């Protein structure tokens, strides 16, 4: 989560924001392409299921919300997939 909020504070630079956008789409941290070859359906979903629930405190969720917020507001889609990626934010 700290890494994520740092990246959020980095994205304030628009070209840095674009680099982060394209880098994260290449990485697919959360779940973007459902083609097998990995353990898909993972990420903040899981840890939200287990730990945040027990704590009753849920900061990562909001932080990652602000993550996409900044990502979209600074960087705009140039591409999302053409048989190479999964086009569309519709997953998230």
């Amino acid at each position: 989560a700290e890494l994520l909020k740092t990246l959020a504070a980095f994205g304030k630079s628009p070209e840095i924001a674009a680099s982060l956008w394209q880098s994260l789409e290449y990485t697919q941290i959360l779940q973007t392409v459902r083609a097998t070859g990995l353990r898909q359906g993972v990420g903040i979903e899981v840890e939200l299921n287990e730990i945040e629930s027990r704590c009753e405190e849920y900061p990562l969720t909001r932080a990652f919300c602000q993550l996409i917020s900044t990502l979209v507001e600074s960087s705009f889609p140039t591409n999302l997939g053409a048989g190479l990626r999964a086009p569309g934010f519709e997953p998230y």
């Binding site: 459902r34 083609a35 097998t36 353990r39 359906g41 899981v46 299921n49 287990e50 629930s53 027990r54």
Partner: protein, 375 residues
């Protein structure tokens, strides 16, 4: 009151609970039971043990405890998991894989027997899909899915024995036996569909929808007082009851709610009580009749706002009484569903009732159980 619950803070999310079977016919709670993960730590199947019944079990927390035994981890969520026989286990994967174990209760392990790696899938995108419903009557096996294929298997095979494909298929919600080899589903169109295991073809074997506010029906089950009459629940809030083995007709259209019936399940010790679970944010026990004049399982539970246990009986001398079932014209009233919230609960994704005994695992990170459903 109604036999308060034992709550065990399991620190775990629950999706699927299914009794470990011994087939034939007996009354006990299967102390052994296999559990499919909502998200426990991963998606996994665990083995768990419950000190059956208030007899010889009033301990190990308060009123018993289920205990973890072993587990093995599973790609794709366990949306559904049914048992072919005493220790052969069949679960659907969100990866669209049909998974069969043979359990080792003594070794406390699960054996990875048989996999249909291939299942229901989306066309025009080449993407995989989970299975909507598995059907297990030993040893014949049926699978039905979002895209609408039909997957007919004899036990013990890693390749498709048959998949009926159609020039007409749809999304499927809930399935039930009508007979030994006759099957019904409720669909996402407001659609009641029929098939026979021996005879099938192209496009659905039988299709129904009629006046009465056809809504996407999510849950169907065959009554604990008879199978060939079944009940279905959908969006509108009205429960639809039917008699078939080749033709549908309504026992009742009960105005039992105003909104979607996500899942409904049937009381064994009471062939005429029901339960409903709904991720609309609530979970109701359904009871015959209405009014608080009978023990109220309409507003029962919720910690406070509790009401139940009222009664009055005519001696049949100069006194007369009538009720709703004695009317055959459709569109009946509400029939006593109570939502219950102890102090706080999250999405209960699996529940089971055996006799007046009840277990249920949830997303509330705990388990809730009762010996008696009433008092």
């Amino acid at each position: 009151m109604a036999d308060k619950f034992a709550a065990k803070f399991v620190s775990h999310k629950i999706s699927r609970t299914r009794w470990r079977p011994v087939s034939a016919s007996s009354l006990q709670q299967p102390d052994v039971f296999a559990t499919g993960s909502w998200d426990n730590e991963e998606n996994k199947v665990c083995v768990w043990a419950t000190s059956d019944f208030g007899a010889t079990s009033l301990d190990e927390e308060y009123q018993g405890d289920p205990k973890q035994l072993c587990d093995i981890k599973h790609p794709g969520d366990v949306m559904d998991m049914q048992f072919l026989d005493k220790e052969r286990i069949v679960t659907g994967s969100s990866t669209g894989t049909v998974t069969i174990f043979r359990h080792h209760e003594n070794n406390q392990t699960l054996s990875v027997n048989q996999r249909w790696e291939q299942a229901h899938y989306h066309v025009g995108s080449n993407m995989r899909a989970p299975c909507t419903a598995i059907v297990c009557s030993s040893p014949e096996i049926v699978s039905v899915g979002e895209d609408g294929r039909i997957n007919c298997f004899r036990a013990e095979s890693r390749d498709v024995l048959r998949t009926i494909d159609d020039a007409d298929s749809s999304t499927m919600h809930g399935v039930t036996f009508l007979r030994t080899t006759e099957i019904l589903t409720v669909n996402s169109v407001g659609q009641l569909k029929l098939w026979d295991l021996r005879k099938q073809g192209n496009d659905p074997t039988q299709i129904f929808s009629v006046t009465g506010e056809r809504v996407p029906l999510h849950c169907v089950d065959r009554h604990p007082n008879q199978q060939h009459v079944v009940a279905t629940g959908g969006q509108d809030g009205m429960l639809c009851i039917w008699d078939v083995r080749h033709g549908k007709m309504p026992m009742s259209l009960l105005n039992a709610h105003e909104a979607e019936m996500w899942e409904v399940h049937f009381h064994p010790s009471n062939p005429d009580h029901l339960f409903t679970c709904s991720e609309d944010g609530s979970l109701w026990h359904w009871d015959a009749s209405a009014d608080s004049e009978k023990p109220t399982f309409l507003l029962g539970g919720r910690s406070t706002f509790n009401i139940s246990r009222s009664s009055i009986a005519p001696p049949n001398a100069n006194q007369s009484l009538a009720c709703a079932w004695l009317s055959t014209d459709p569109t009946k009233g509400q029939l006593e569903i109570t939502n219950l919230l102890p102090s706080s609960t999250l999405s209960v994704n699996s529940l089971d009732v055996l006799g007046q005994n009840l277990v249920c695992g949830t997303d509330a990170e705990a388990i809730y159980v009762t010996r008696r459903l009433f008092s």
